[PDB]
Design a protein around this ligand. Structure first.
Ligand SMILES: CCCCCCCC/C=C/CCCCCCCC(=O)O[C@H](COC(=O)CCCCCCCCCCCCCCC)COP(=O)([O-])OCC[N+](C)(C)C
Ligand SMILES: CCCCCCCC/C=C/CCCCCCCC(=O)O[C@H](COC(=O)CCCCCCCCCCCCCCC)COP(=O)([O-])OCC[N+](C)(C)C
Ligand SMILES: CCCCCCCC/C=C/CCCCCCCC(=O)O[C@H](COC(=O)CCCCCCCCCCCCCCC)COP(=O)([O-])OCC[N+](C)(C)C
Ligand SMILES: CCCCCCCC/C=C/CCCCCCCC(=O)O[C@H](COC(=O)CCCCCCCCCCCCCCC)COP(=O)([O-])OCC[N+](C)(C)C
Ligand SMILES: CCCCCCCC/C=C\CCCCCCCC(=O)O[C@H](COC(=O)CCCCCCCCCCCCCCC)COP(=O)([O-])OCC[N+](C)(C)C
Ligand SMILES: CCCCCCCC/C=C\CCCCCCCC(=O)O[C@H](COC(=O)CCCCCCCCCCCCCCC)COP(=O)([O-])OCC[N+](C)(C)C
Ligand SMILES: CC(C)CCC[C@@H](C)[C@H]1CC[C@H]2[C@@H]3CC=C4C[C@@H](O)CC[C@]4(C)[C@H]3CC[C@]12C
Ligand SMILES: CC(C)CCC[C@@H](C)[C@H]1CC[C@H]2[C@@H]3CC=C4C[C@@H](O)CC[C@]4(C)[C@H]3CC[C@]12C
Ligand SMILES: CC(C)CCC[C@@H](C)[C@H]1CC[C@H]2[C@@H]3CC=C4C[C@@H](O)CC[C@]4(C)[C@H]3CC[C@]12C
Ligand SMILES: CC(C)CCC[C@@H](C)[C@H]1CC[C@H]2[C@@H]3CC=C4C[C@@H](O)CC[C@]4(C)[C@H]3CC[C@]12C
Ligand SMILES: O=C(O)c1ccccc1O
Ligand SMILES: O=C(O)c1ccccc1O
Lengths: 605, 605
C-alpha cells in the first residue's frame, strides 16, 4: 500500500532507477564522498571527545538507513561539525578528563550513545506528529547567520591542533572570547614541527584543488585532495618519525572489525535530555535546509515529515550500532552534487568505501598527525565562511532580514550555538509583527469618470464622494494593530464619534435648561476590507466598537470586500446583531457608495 | 519645555484639576483603597518572606512617586501577588531558613532591596530606549491566561495559612502538584482554632460585601469590609488570647516610625539578575495591561514609554527607602475606579492613609491572626478566577486565540510563572505565522458586462478572459508562504513552466535528429498584488523565479495593484531588469487585461 511505500521510499524510487546514464555518475560521487568522509569522520570524532573509530562508524551506518527511509536525493548524512561540538560539550561535562583512560572512554561512548538515541527519538516524534511544517519558519537569513557563526566556532576549535597547544576551552556564554585569548596566551608554547606539517598540509591541499580545477579532465573521477594529503602525511610522519622525536600529536590506534552492538544506558536520561533536544533541533534545521536547497535547485519536492522520520530512524539504529548523531551537511552535500550524485545510491557507495576502510585499511592511519585533520576541516569551512557575502545583500534590500542574519550570527558566536538559534528564531518571528503593527491606512476617492477608488494623498485626481467617507486599512486587524487602526480611523476621517456624541449631549441638555451640534461631514463610512486577510478576537471587538460609536452619532458603517473567512469570524463573534446587518456587506467600494447615495435619496422623499 | 512636562506629567495635569466635582470622589476612592492596602500590604509581605512592615512601606512610597511621573489615571500601584511570589522564591533560595532570626531578616531584606533596584533599572531602561511598543504584542488572551494561572498559585499559597499547616513549598516546575499533595498529606495536622477564625473571617467578609452592595447607600463611602474584619479579628485574638492558648499563628511586631534610608548591596547582582529581569517583565506586563484597560474604558490614552519610566523611577526610589517591587494591579485598580477615582490624587490619598498607619496605629496589628489575611487575599482573588469565563468565548470564535489562553494558563500553573509567560508569548507570536502560512489563492474571472474580476470557484458568473490567466494571492509573500505561493500558482494555472520548457526542448531536439509543443492556454499571466501587504527578501527571490520561468515558455507576467512599498522592495531587490519592466506594473487587473489583449492584437498585424 501507498503508506508502506511512503514510509519506505527506497521500495518506490529504486525500481525506476535507469542503470545507463546515472550508475556511472553515482559511483563517481560515492567514491569522491567516501574519500572525503574518512578524514572528516575521524576529525569530527575527536572534536566530540570520543575515540577516532566512532567517526568511521557514524560515516557507515547512518547513510545506509537514510538511503532506505529518506526523501532527498542530494543530501549526504554523516558526522557533522556543529552536532559534534554539542556532543563534545556534554561528554566532557558528564565525564571529566581525570585502566583509567579505557574506563573513561567506555563511560564517554555510553554518554554519546544515550545522546544519539534521545536525539533520534525526538526527531522521529516530530515526524510522526506531522509537525514538520514548522521547519518552514526557519528563514534563509536565519540559516545563513547560524551556519556562518557555527563556522567561526569550528575554525577556533581547530586552531589549537594546528599549532600544537594543549588549551582547554568551552562552548558556553562568551566562550569564543576566552578561547581565542587562551590561544593568544599559549602562542609561545607553539610546537614548530606541528606548525610545519600543518602548513605543508595546507600547501598540498590548495595546490591539488587549484590544479585539478583549472587543468584538463583526463579523469572520470576528480583528484581526491584530502585522501592523498592524509596518505602523504601518514607516510612522512612514519618515515621521519614525528610522533616520538618532535612530539607531534598523532591519531591513536584505529581498531579493525565491524561495530559492536551496544545499548544506550538510560540512567543518564535526566542529565542529557536538554542537550539531546538541542542536537535534535540543530540536526532537523541543517538536514532539512540542505534537502530543500538541493530540491529547489534540481526541481523536486521533499516531505518534511518523512525527512524527520528518516533522520530519526537513522539516529536510533546508529545508537544501537556504536554511532554518534549524524545529520545532513551542506559541505558533503555540495561535494556529492558537484561529483554527479543523482540518487541515494551515492550514499550507499560512500558507506561501502568507509566499510572497506573499517575492515581492512584501519591501522594505516596510526602515524596520521592531528594537524592534517585540522587543516582539512579549515579548507572545507571556506563554503560557510563565504556566506558573509549575504550580510550586505540583505542590508541593501530588507533591513529586518539583515537584522535576522546579524542577530543569529552574533547569538551563535558571542553566546551558545543552541541559544544563538533560539534567539534568531525568536527575532525571526517578531519581524512579522513589526511589519504588520503600523499598517498603511488610506482615505479613498473616486477617479473622475471611472468606477474605481484609490488613495487621495497618492492620487490627487481622485475626489471624495459627498456624504460618504471611505477608509481602507491594508493589513489584518489583530491584537498588534487594532488600537492603531481605530486611532488612524478617527484621525483620517477627522471625526471622533465619542467626542461628537459628548458635545451633542452637552449642547442639547444645556439648551434644555436655558429654555425650560458638531458638524460631521458624512452620513456613511465605508470600510474597504479587501486587504484585510484575517481578523482575530481583538479585531472583531474593535470593529464592534467602531460600528456602535458611529451608530450613536447617526452614521451607517458598511463593509465592502470582506473575504469569506472574515465575514464568518465576524458572524461567530456577534458583529451582525447590534446595528450592522449582513446586508451592509457589499462586494466592492462602488456597490456600497451606490447603495449609500440611494438610501439617502429614498429617505429625503 | 514640553520634554520636562512630558517627563513630569504631574506639573501638566495638576493645575487643570477642577476642585468641585472630583476632589470628593478621589478622597472617597483614596480612603477606600488605603483601607484595602493595609491588610493586603501585610499579607503580600509575608508571601514574599520579608517581615510584615515592608508591605506598609511598599504601600506608601511607590504610589507617591507614580503619581508624580505616571500617565495612567485609574491604576493603583503597590505590593501585588505575583511579584511578591517571585521575590519570595529568590529570598528563601539565597537565604535558607536556618540573634540568628534578626541576622537572617537583615540579609533577607538586603536581597529584596537588590531585587527592587535591578527591576526598577530594567523598566527605566526599556522606557528610555523607546521599547514600550513591544508591550502591544501582549495579547488580551495571553494576559487573561497568565493572570488566571497566577491566581491558582496565589490561592494554593494561602491554603497553608488558612488551616494552620507548616508545609514548605516551591514555585518551580510542576510545583503546584507537589504543593497540593503536600497539603493533602498534612491535612490531619489541621489546627482547629485556626480553621475557626478563617471561616469566621470568610462569613464576616461575604456578609459585609453582600449587605453594603444590595442595601441603601446612606453613606458617601462604602463599608470597608477588609478593615473592619481585621479590626474584629485582632480584638477577638487579643481578648480570647488565641496566639498562646490554641497556638493560632499571628502577625509579629509591627514597628512604629518612617522607613530607614537603605542601600541595595550589589555584591548579589549576578545571583539575582535573572529573577530581577523576570520581576521587571511581569511588572510591565500587568501594570501597562491595567493602564490600557482603564484608559480604553474611560476614553483616554497612556504613553507606554512614560509608563516604563514611571514604574522604573517608582521602584528605584522605593529600593533606597526600604520597599520591595511595586506594580499596578487589576484588583486595587478596579476598587480605585468603582470607589470614584478620577486622578492620581486617589493614589496620594491612599498613601497618606498608609502613612498615618505606619506612624501611629502600627502595633495594634500584633494579635491579628495570619488566617484573616489569607481569607482577605482569597475573597479578592474572585475577580481573576472569574476569567475562566474567557476560555469558552475564545473557543466559540477563534481556536488559535483559545490556544493562546490555554497555553499561557497551563504554562503558568504546571511550570514556572516566568516560563508560563515566556511560552505564552512565543505561541502568541507563532499564531500570526500559522494564519499567513497557507494563504487563500484564487483564479479570477471578469463578471459579464462589468469591469470587475472575482474568484471563479466562489462566483460561477465570472468567465476567464481568453489568453489571459489572472491569479491573486491574499497575503504577504514572505519566507513562511513563498514555496506555497509558487506551488499554488503552478497548480491553479495548470501549467508548470519548467516541465513545459523541458517537454518543448526534448520534442525540438528529437525532431532535429529524426529530420537531420505543450499547449499552454495563455499568453499573459497577471498577478493581482492588491492584498500583498509586504514582500521580504525570499519573496522578491521567488517572484524573480516565477517571472523568469514564464519568460522562457514565452508568457508575459504583469503585476496589477502593487502598493508603493512592494514596488520599492522589488526595485531594490532587482526584479525590474531581467524580463519585467516598470511598465508591466498596472493599477488594477482591468488595465492589465486591456494592455495584454492590445499587445497581442498589435503583434498579429
Ligand atoms: C536590548 C535589550 C532589550 C530587548 C531586546 C530588543 C527587542 C527587539 C528589538 C527590536 C528592534 C527592532 C526595531 C525595528 C523597527 C522596524 C523598523 C526597522 O528596523 O526598519 C529599518 C530601520 O531600522 C533598522 O532596521 C536599523 C538597522 C540598523 C540597526 C543596527 C545596525 C548595526 C550596525 C552594524 C554593527 C555590527 C555590530 C554591532 C551591532 C549590534 C528600515 O528599513 P527599510 O529598508 O527602510 O525598510 C524595511 C521595512 N521596515 C522594517 C522599515 C518596515
Ligand atoms: C537560557 C535561556 C535563554 C532564554 C532566551 C529567551 C528567548 C529569546 C527571544 C528573542 C526575542 C528577540 C530578542 C532579540 C533582540 C534583538 C536585539 C536588537 O535589535 O539588537 C540589534 C543588534 O544587537 C545584537 O547584536 C543582538 C545580539 C543578541 C540579542 C539578545 C537579546 C536578548 C536575549 C538574550 C538571552 C540571554 C541569555 C543569557 C545566557 C544565559 C540592534 O538593535 P536595533 O535597535 O534593532 O538597532 C537598530 C535601531 N532601531 C532604529 C531599529 C531601533
Ligand atoms: C509537543 C512538543 C512539540 C513542540 C510544541 C508544538 C509546536 C506548536 C504547535 C502548533 C500546533 C498548532 C496547529 C494549529 C494549526 C492551525 C489550525 C488550527 O489550529 O485551527 C483550528 C483547528 O485546530 C485547533 O485549533 C484545535 C483546537 C483544539 C486543540 C486542543 C484542545 C484541547 C482540549 C482541552 C483539554 C484541556 C487540557 C489538555 C489539553 C492540552 C480551527 O479553528 P477554526 O475555528 O476552524 O478557525 C480559526 C482559524 N484557523 C486557525 C483554523 C486558521
Ligand atoms: C528554561 C528555558 C525554557 C526555554 C523555553 C523556550 C521558549 C518557548 C517557545 C514557545 C513556542 C511554542 C511552544 C508552545 C507549544 C504549544 C503546544 C500545543 O499546541 O499544545 C496544545 C496544548 O498543550 C499544552 O497544554 C501545552 C503546554 C505548554 C507548552 C509547552 C511547549 C514546549 C516548551 C516548554 C519549555 C519547557 C521548559 C522546561 C523546564 C525547564 C495542544 O496541541 P495542538 O496540537 O495545538 O492541539 C490541537 C490539535 N491540532 C489539530 C492543532 C494539531
Ligand atoms: C544545562 C543546560 C542549560 C544551558 C544554558 C541555559 C539556557 C538553556 C537554553 C538552551 C537549551 C536549548 C534548546 C533549544 C535549542 C533550539 C531552540 C530553537 O531553535 O527554538 C525553536 C523552538 O523552541 C523550542 O520549542 C525550544 C524547546 C525547549 C527546549 C528547552 C528546554 C531545556 C530544558 C530541558 C528539560 C529539563 C530536564 C528534564 C527534567 C529535569 C526550535 O527550532 P526550529 O528550527 O523551529 O525546530 C523546530 C522544528 N520542529 C519541532 C517543528 C520539527
Ligand atoms: C536560575 C534561574 C533559572 C530558572 C529556570 C530555568 C529557565 C530559565 C527561564 C526563566 C527566566 C525568565 C525570564 C523571562 C520572563 C518573561 C519572558 C517573556 O515574557 O518573554 C518576552 C521576551 O523574552 C525575552 O526577551 C526574555 C529575556 C531574557 C531573560 C532570560 C535570561 C535568563 C538568564 C539571566 C542572565 C544570567 C546571569 C548573568 C551572568 C552570570 C518578554 O515579555 P513582554 O511582556 O513582551 O515584555 C517585554 C516588553 N518590553 C521589553 C518591550 C518593555
Ligand atoms: C574553490 C574552492 C572549492 C577551493 C578554494 C581553495 C581553498 C580550499 C583553500 C586554498 C588556500 C587556503 C588557505 C591557505 C592557508 C591558510 C592559512 C591558515 O593559517 C588558515 C587557512 C588559510 C587562509 C586557507 C583557507 C582555505 C583556502 C583558501
Ligand atoms: C563583521 C560581521 C559582524 C558582519 C557585519 C556586517 C555589517 C555590519 C556591514 C559589513 C558589510 C557592510 C556593507 C558593505 C557595503 C555597503 C555599500 C555601501 O554603499 C552602503 C553600506 C553597505 C551596504 C554596508 C552596510 C553595513 C555592512 C552590511
Ligand atoms: C461581587 C463581589 C465583589 C463579591 C462576591 C463575594 C466574594 C468576595 C466571596 C463571598 C463568599 C466567598 C466564598 C466563601 C467561602 C469560601 C470557602 C473557602 O474555603 C474558599 C473560598 C470561598 C469559596 C469564598 C470565595 C469568595 C466569595 C465568593
Ligand atoms: C479547566 C481549564 C484547563 C479550562 C479548560 C477549558 C476548556 C478545555 C473547555 C471548558 C469549557 C468548554 C466549553 C464550554 C461550553 C461549550 C459549548 C458547547 O456547545 C460546545 C463546546 C464548548 C464551547 C466548550 C469547549 C471546551 C471548553 C472551552
Ligand atoms: O556544513 C555545514 O552545514 C556546517 C554548518 C556549520 C558549521 C560548519 C559546517 O560545516
Ligand atoms: O490583580 C492582579 O493583577 C493579579 C494577577 C495575578 C494573580 C493575582 C492577582 O491579584
Amino acid at each position: 500500500k501507498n503508506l508502506l511505500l511512503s514510509f519506505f521510499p527506497i521500495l518506490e524510487w529504486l525500481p525506476k532507477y535507469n542503470l545507463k546514464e546515472w550508475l556511472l555518475g553515482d559511483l563517481i560521487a560515492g567514491l569522491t564522498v567516501g574519500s572525503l568522509q574518512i578524514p572528516q569522520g575521524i576529525a569530527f570524532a575527536l572534536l566530540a571527545g570520543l575515540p577516532p573509530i566512532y567517526g568511521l562508524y557514524s560515516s557507515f551506518f547512518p547513510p545506509l538507513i537514510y538511503a532506505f527511509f529518506g526523501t532527498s536525493r542530494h543530501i549526504s548524512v554523516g558526522p557533522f561539525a556543529v552536532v559534534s561540538l554539542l556532543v563534545g560539550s556534554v561528554v566532557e561535562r558528564l565525564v571529566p578528563d581525570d585502566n583509567g583512560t579505557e574506563a573513561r572512554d567506555a563511560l564517554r561512548v555510553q554518554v554519546a550513545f544515550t545522546l544519539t538515541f534521545l536525539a533520534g527519538i525526538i526527531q522521529l516524534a516530530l515526524g510522526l506528529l506531522r509537525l514538520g511544517f514548522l521547519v518552514d519558519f526557519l528563514s534563509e537569513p536565519l540559516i545563513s547567520g547560524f551556519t556562518t557563526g557555527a563556522a567561526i566556532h569550528i575554525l577556533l576549535s581547530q586552531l589549537k591542533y594546528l599549532l600544537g597547544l594543549k588549551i582547554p576551552r568551552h562552548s558556553g556564554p562568551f566562550s569564543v572570547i576566552y578561547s581565542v585569548i587562551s590561544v593568544f596566551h599559549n602562542i609561545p608554547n607553539t610546537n614548530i614541527a606541528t606548525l610545519g606539517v600543518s602548513l605543508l598540509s595546507f600547501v598540498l591541499l590548495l595546490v591539488v584543488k587549484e590544479l585539478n580545477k583549472r587543468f584538463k579532465k583526463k579523469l572520470p573521477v576528480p583528484i581526491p585532495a584530502e585522501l592523498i594529503v592524509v596518505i602523504l602525511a601518514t607516510l612522512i610522519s612514519y618515515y621521519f618519525n614525528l610522533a616520538e622525536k618532535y612530539g607531534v600529536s598523532i591519531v591513536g590506534h584505529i581498531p579493525k572489525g565491524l561495530p559492536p552492538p551496544s545499548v544506550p544506558d538510560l540512567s543518564l536520561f535526566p542529565l542529557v535530555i536538554g542537550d539531546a533536544i538541542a542536537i535534535a533541533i540543530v540536526g532537523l534545521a541543517v538536514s532539512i535546509s540542505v534537502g530543500k536547497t538541493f530540491a529547489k535547485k534540481h526541481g523536486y519536492q521533499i516531505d518534511g515529515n518523512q525527512e524527520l522520520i528518516a533522520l530519526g530512524l537513522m539516529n536510533i539504529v546508529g545508537s544501537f550500532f556504536s554511532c554518534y548523531p549524524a545529520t545532513g551537511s551542506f559541505s558533503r552535500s555540495a561535494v556529492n552534487e558537484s561529483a554527479g550524485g543523482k540518487t541515494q545510491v551515492a550514499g550507499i557507495v560512500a558507506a561501502l568505501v568507509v566499510l572497506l576502510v573499517l575492515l581492512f585499511l584501519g591501522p594505516l592511519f596510526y602515524y596520521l598527525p592531528k594537524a592534517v585533520l585540522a587543516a582539512i576541516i579549515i579548507v572545507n569551512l571556506k563554503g560557510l565562511l563565504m556566506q558573509f557575502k549575504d550580510a550586505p545583500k540583505l542590508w541593501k534590500v530588507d533591513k529586518l532580514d539583515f537584522l535576522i542574519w546579524l542577530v543569529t550570527f552574533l547569538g551563535v558566536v558571542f553566546l551558545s550555538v543552541e541559544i544563538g538559534l533560539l534567539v534568531g528564531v525568536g527575532f525571526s518571528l517578531l519581524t512579522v509583527l513589526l511589519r504588520t503593527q503600523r499598517p498603511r491606512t488610506s482615505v479613498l476617492g473616486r477617479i473622475p469618470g471611472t468606477d474605481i477608488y484609490r488613495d487621495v494623498k497618492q492620487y490627487p485626481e481622485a475626489e471624495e464622494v459627498p456624504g460618504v467617507k471611505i477608509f481602507r486599512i491594508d493589513s489584518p486587524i489583530y491584537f498588534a494593530n487594532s488600537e492603531y487602526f481605530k486611532e488612524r480611523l478617527k484621525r483620517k476621517t477627522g471625526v471622533d464619534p465619542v467626542k461628537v456624541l459628548a458635545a451633542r449631549k452637552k449642547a442639547l441638555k444645556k439648551i434644555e435648561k436655558e429654555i425650560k451640534p458638531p458638524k460631521v461631514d458624512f452620513h456613511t463610512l465605508i470600510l474597504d476590507f479587501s486587504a484585510v486577510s484575517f481578523v482575530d478576537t481583538v479585531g472583531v471587538k474593535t470593529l464592534k466598537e467602531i460600528v456602535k460609536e458611529y451608530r450613536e452619532i447617526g452614521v451607517q458603517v458598511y463593509l465592502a470586500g470582506c473575504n469569506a473567512s472574515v465575514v464568518e469570524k465576524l458572524e461567530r463573534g456577534g458583529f451582525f446583531d447590534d446595528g450592522i446587518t449582513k446586508e451592509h456587506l457589499f462586494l466592492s467600494v462602488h456597490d456600497a457608495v451606490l447603495f449609500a447615495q440611494a438610501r439617502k435619496a429614498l429617505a429625503e422623499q
